[PDB]
Design a protein around this nucleic acid. Structure first.
Lengths: 55, 56
DNA sequence: TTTTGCCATGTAATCCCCGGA
DNA sequence: ATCCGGGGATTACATGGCAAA
């Protein structure tokens, strides 16, 4: 279970604020730039939406 | 994965009768029907899924 | 305070069904 | 039947905090 770096967390949050649902292209670019697997990005966005739902 | 299977006539008759009351199956009834029909629970789940799409 | 013990909260991941193609 | 990504719920585990001798 990876622990995202705050450099990664800040970019994911910044991306999430801009678009809370990923396109394949955006998922790909983020994986590349952040050095993470596309599945982790997918799962981070999925969990973020669910967290926000219980705000 | 999972080989296709031809449903027998009592099978389909039984699946349609159930589908006639409720288009969604709870896991409890799906287990039930699976045991009564001799149908794998996955096959029943997929039959309800496809049938929901055809009817729509 | 220190330093120890544990338990609550957070969260990455998995289960499991859904519709659409 | 398969694939995907979606949701909701749940699991599994790290660490945040607070307790306390």
């Amino acid at each position: 279970r990876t622990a995202f770096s705050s450099e990664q967390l800040a970019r994911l949050k910044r991306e999430f604020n801009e678009n809370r649902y990923l396109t394949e292209r955006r998922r790909q670019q983020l994986s590349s730039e952040l050095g993470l697997n596309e599945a982790q990005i997918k799962i981070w966005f999925k969990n973020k939406r669910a967290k926000i739902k219980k705000s």
